[PDB]
Coordinates of C-alpha atoms and ligand atoms in Angstrom, one line a residue:
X23 CA 0.0 0.1 -0.1
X24 CA 1.1 3.6 -0.4
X25 CA 0.7 5.5 2.6
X26 CA 0.7 9.3 3.6
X27 CA 1.1 8.8 7.2
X28 CA 3.2 6.1 9.2
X29 CA 3.7 6.7 12.9
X30 CA 5.0 10.2 13.3
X31 CA 6.3 10.3 9.7
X32 CA 4.2 12.3 7.0
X33 CA 4.7 12.5 3.2
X34 CA 6.3 15.9 2.1
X35 CA 8.2 16.3 5.4
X36 CA 11.9 17.3 5.2
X37 CA 14.1 14.4 6.3
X38 CA 17.8 13.2 6.3
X39 CA 18.5 10.1 4.2
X40 CA 21.6 7.7 3.9
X41 CA 23.3 7.8 0.6
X42 CA 25.4 5.0 -0.8
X43 CA 28.5 7.0 0.2
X44 CA 27.2 6.1 3.7
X45 CA 26.9 10.1 4.3
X46 CA 23.7 11.5 5.3
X47 CA 21.9 14.3 3.2
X48 CA 18.9 16.5 3.4
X49 CA 15.8 15.4 1.3
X50 CA 12.1 15.4 1.2
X51 CA 10.0 12.3 2.0
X52 CA 8.0 11.8 -1.1
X53 CA 6.3 8.3 -0.5
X54 CA 5.7 5.7 2.1
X55 CA 5.2 2.1 0.7
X56 CA 4.3 -0.9 2.5
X57 CA 5.0 -4.5 1.2
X58 CA 3.4 -6.9 3.8
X59 CA 5.1 -6.4 7.3
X60 CA 7.8 -4.2 5.4
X61 CA 8.0 -0.4 5.1
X62 CA 10.0 1.7 2.8
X63 CA 10.6 5.4 2.5
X64 CA 11.1 7.2 -0.8
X65 CA 13.3 10.3 -0.4
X66 CA 14.2 12.8 -3.0
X67 CA 17.5 14.4 -2.2
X68 CA 18.3 18.0 -2.8
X69 CA 20.2 17.1 -6.0
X70 CA 17.0 15.6 -7.3
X71 CA 18.3 11.8 -7.0
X72 CA 15.9 9.5 -5.5
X73 CA 16.6 6.5 -3.2
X74 CA 14.0 3.9 -1.8
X75 CA 15.1 3.4 1.9
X76 CA 14.5 1.3 4.8
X77 CA 13.3 3.3 8.0
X78 CA 16.7 2.9 9.7
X79 CA 18.2 4.7 6.8
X80 CA 16.2 7.8 7.3
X81 CA 16.5 10.2 10.3
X82 CA 14.7 13.2 11.4
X83 CA 16.1 16.8 10.7
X84 CA 15.9 17.9 14.3
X85 CA 18.1 17.4 17.5
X86 CA 16.1 15.2 19.9
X87 CA 15.7 16.0 23.7
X88 CA 18.2 14.7 26.2
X89 CA 15.6 12.2 27.4
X90 CA 15.1 10.5 24.2
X91 CA 18.9 9.6 24.1
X92 CA 20.0 6.3 25.7
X93 CA 23.1 4.3 25.5
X94 CA 22.4 2.4 22.3
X95 CA 20.4 4.9 20.5
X96 CA 21.0 5.1 16.9
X97 CA 21.9 8.5 15.6
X98 CA 23.5 10.6 12.9
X99 CA 26.2 12.8 14.0
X100 CA 28.5 15.6 12.9
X101 CA 31.6 13.5 11.9
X102 CA 35.1 15.4 12.0
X103 CA 32.2 17.9 8.3
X104 CA 29.8 15.1 7.2
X105 CA 26.7 13.4 8.9
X106 CA 27.4 9.9 9.6
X107 CA 25.6 7.2 11.6
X108 CA 26.6 6.0 15.1
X109 CA 25.4 4.8 18.4
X110 CA 25.2 6.7 21.6
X111 CA 28.0 5.3 24.0
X112 CA 27.5 8.0 26.8
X113 CA 25.0 10.6 27.8
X114 CA 25.9 13.9 29.6
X115 CA 27.4 13.7 32.9
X116 CA 29.9 15.3 35.3
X117 CA 32.9 13.3 34.1
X118 CA 32.4 14.0 30.3
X119 CA 31.8 17.5 30.7
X120 CA 28.0 17.3 29.6
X121 CA 28.6 15.6 26.3
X122 CA 27.4 12.7 24.3
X123 CA 30.1 10.0 23.3
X124 CA 29.2 8.6 19.8
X125 CA 30.6 5.2 18.5
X126 CA 30.5 5.8 14.6
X127 CA 29.6 2.9 12.3
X128 CA 33.5 2.7 11.1
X129 CA 34.9 2.5 14.7
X130 CA 35.7 6.3 15.2
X131 CA 34.7 7.5 18.7
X132 CA 34.1 11.5 19.3
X133 CA 32.3 13.5 21.9
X134 CA 29.8 15.9 20.4
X135 CA 26.8 18.3 21.5
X136 CA 23.2 17.7 21.4
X137 CA 23.0 20.2 18.3
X138 CA 25.3 17.8 16.3
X139 CA 22.9 14.9 16.7
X140 CA 19.7 13.6 14.9
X141 CA 17.7 10.7 15.5
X142 CA 17.4 7.6 13.2
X143 CA 13.5 7.5 12.5
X144 CA 12.9 4.0 12.7
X145 CA 15.9 2.1 14.5
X146 CA 16.4 -1.9 14.6
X147 CA 15.2 -3.4 17.8
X148 CA 18.9 -4.1 18.5
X149 CA 20.2 -1.1 17.1
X150 CA 23.5 -2.1 16.2
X151 CA 22.2 -4.8 13.8
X152 CA 22.5 -2.5 10.9
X153 CA 26.3 -1.8 11.4
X154 CA 27.7 -3.3 8.4
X155 CA 31.4 -4.2 9.8
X156 CA 30.9 -7.2 11.8
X157 CA 33.8 -6.4 14.3
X158 CA 32.2 -2.9 15.0
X159 CA 28.8 -4.6 15.2
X160 CA 29.9 -7.1 17.8
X161 CA 31.8 -4.6 19.8
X162 CA 28.7 -2.3 20.2
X163 CA 26.5 -5.2 20.9
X164 CA 28.8 -6.2 23.8
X165 CA 29.2 -2.5 25.0
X166 CA 25.4 -1.7 25.0
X167 CA 24.5 -4.8 26.6
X168 CA 27.2 -4.8 29.3
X169 CA 26.7 -1.2 30.1
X170 CA 27.1 0.3 32.8
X171 CA 29.9 -2.3 33.2
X172 CA 32.7 -0.8 31.1
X173 CA 36.3 -2.0 31.4
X174 CA 38.6 0.9 30.5
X175 CA 42.3 1.3 30.9
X176 CA 43.5 4.1 33.2
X177 CA 46.1 6.2 31.2
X178 CA 48.1 9.3 31.8
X179 CA 50.0 11.8 29.6
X180 CA 53.2 10.7 28.8
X181 CA 52.6 7.0 29.4
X182 CA 54.2 4.6 27.1
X183 CA 51.7 1.9 25.6
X184 CA 51.4 -0.3 22.3
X185 CA 48.5 0.6 20.2
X186 CA 47.3 -1.4 17.2
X187 CA 47.3 0.0 13.6
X188 CA 46.7 -2.0 10.5
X189 CA 46.8 -5.4 12.4
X190 CA 50.1 -4.8 14.2
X191 CA 51.3 -3.3 17.4
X192 CA 53.2 0.1 17.3
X193 CA 55.1 2.0 20.1
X194 CA 53.0 4.9 21.2
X195 CA 52.5 7.5 23.9
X196 CA 49.7 8.9 25.6
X197 CA 49.3 12.7 24.8
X198 CA 46.1 13.5 26.4
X199 CA 43.0 12.3 27.8
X200 CA 39.4 13.7 27.6
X201 CA 36.8 11.4 29.5
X202 CA 36.5 8.0 28.0
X203 CA 38.9 9.0 25.1
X204 CA 42.6 9.1 24.9
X205 CA 44.8 10.8 22.2
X206 CA 47.6 8.3 21.2
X207 CA 50.7 9.5 19.5
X208 CA 52.2 6.8 17.2
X209 CA 55.9 7.4 17.8
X210 CA 57.4 6.4 14.6
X211 CA 54.5 7.9 12.4
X212 CA 54.5 11.1 14.7
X213 CA 50.6 11.5 14.3
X214 CA 47.9 11.4 16.6
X215 CA 44.6 9.5 16.9
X216 CA 41.6 9.7 19.6
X217 CA 40.8 6.2 20.8
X218 CA 38.2 4.9 23.2
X219 CA 39.8 3.7 26.5
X220 CA 38.1 0.6 26.4
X221 CA 39.2 -0.2 22.8
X222 CA 41.3 -3.5 22.3
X223 CA 43.4 -1.4 20.2
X224 CA 45.2 -0.3 23.3
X225 CA 47.3 -3.4 24.1
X226 CA 46.6 -3.1 27.9
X227 CA 42.8 -3.6 27.0
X228 CA 43.6 -6.5 24.4
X229 CA 45.8 -8.4 26.9
Ligands
6S4_315 C1 44.8 9.7 10.4 C2 44.9 8.7 11.6 C3 43.6 8.0 12.1 C4 45.6 9.7 12.7 N1 46.2 7.8 11.3 C5 47.4 8.1 10.7 O1 47.8 9.3 10.6 C6 48.3 6.9 10.5 C7 48.7 6.4 11.8 C8 49.9 5.3 11.8 C9 50.2 4.5 12.9 C10 51.4 3.8 12.9 C11 52.0 3.7 11.6 C12 51.7 4.4 10.5 C13 50.7 5.3 10.5 C14 50.3 6.0 9.3 N2 49.5 7.2 9.5

């Protein structure tokens, strides 16, 4: 069937849709289609290109209130600028200086503000199940289900550790810490990366 209304969605509303590039872009919801138990959402992007999308591949073009965001919520967030999908790993608290921690679908982790977040319209029941990379998907499942039990390594600036990159271990140094993230300096390459303190890319977490 062709619908005009479906839950809180209405044909003609402005929305965000996931493109094949895996970045998300503004468009208009031009149709809602049911095929038995299934639903699909036709989006006309602002370049005139059209996609027929599942409801987990559209997001509202507003920032949700704090009380609708949980650990495990499926969101689109500003990725450092593209909009990219992720999972809420932390909500605002004193220890994170009132920010949201996002685990993006590619494994990148970043703190963001409410104004950098958008809610996915029809998330899956197990919100991680549409994470394409299986290693990332399993990590998020474990993290979200185990929460608030979160093993993390306690690290201090100047500390020498081994960090993973491209499947091998590298000599590295902790440059700074920000909440649940650590900025690692790869010593040979002389460049830095922000990494989650519970990541098994930090050899102390792996071992
Ligand atoms: C862009 C980020 C994520 C900082 N990565 C890099 O710049 C990588 C980091 C790295 C680590 C060990 C050995 C070689 C390399 C090459 N550049």
